[PDB]
Amino acid sequence: KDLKGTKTAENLKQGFIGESMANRRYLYFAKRADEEGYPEIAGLLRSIAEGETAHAFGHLDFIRQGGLTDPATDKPIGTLEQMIESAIAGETYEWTQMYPGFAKVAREEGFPEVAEWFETLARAEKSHAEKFQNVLKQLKGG
Amino acid sequence: GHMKDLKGTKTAENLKQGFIGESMANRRYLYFAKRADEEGYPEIAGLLRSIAEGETAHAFGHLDFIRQGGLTDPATDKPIGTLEQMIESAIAGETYEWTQMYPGFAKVAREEGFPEVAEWFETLARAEKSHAEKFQNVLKQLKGG
């Protein structure tokens, strides 16, 4: 039956957010175990991180198979072309609005190094958008 | 000025939202790459994978500023300065997931008529309980020597 508008739709989205964060967090923590000489702990973090990849991807499977949109962009992700279109939408939001706004707030709050980081990221997501736009032209053009 | 205190600022909130978006971007792009793989688009798959490495760098940089600025883990609101604190944050998130989040998700899925999704959430609840237990076992090592 149709997932659209249900609480289960929203729970799949929030599950995807948390699983995405868990993989990132655990791989960041593993770097600290690496440098301090705890290979067993780093290995466990990396193996559990693969678990959280499987969890995130399974959430996306139900989302996609249920006709729901991308948690990050609210765009469909059924076909490869739609996937690339979702990538373009998010990169475009990030470089045109999100990261420039974050940089302005950081400057105005007295954090110039954080602002410089956000400006580096804005330029980076702009490059991403351009590379994905070239892929979209290849796919849509055949 | 890497250690400037960020508590209470709008910048603190923006670092957290940045981390959330970068975390999702890496997962999304690796999931999309699998579709490119199946369909025979290795150049698209490779670009997705390389850009996904960029988003890993972005996410980790946000975590650097969060930690240096005196802020907590975006996922758990626990400090993540030391390795012990990092593992404690992992345990806290896993515990929330298996005691509350995924059981509740599973109950709602059953109530709305989505038994296959409910089964998946129940599998994940048991999985995060195992995660919490494996993490608790290594914390006992750090804290005992």
Ligand SMILES: [Cl-]
């Ligand atoms: Cl170890």
Ligand SMILES: [Cl-]
């Ligand atoms: Cl290709």
Ligand code: NI
């Ligand atoms: Ni998980």
Ligand code: NI
């Ligand atoms: Ni990007």
Ligand code: NI
């Ligand atoms: Ni400094």
Ligand code: NI
């Ligand atoms: Ni990024």
Ligand code: NI
């Ligand atoms: Ni887990």
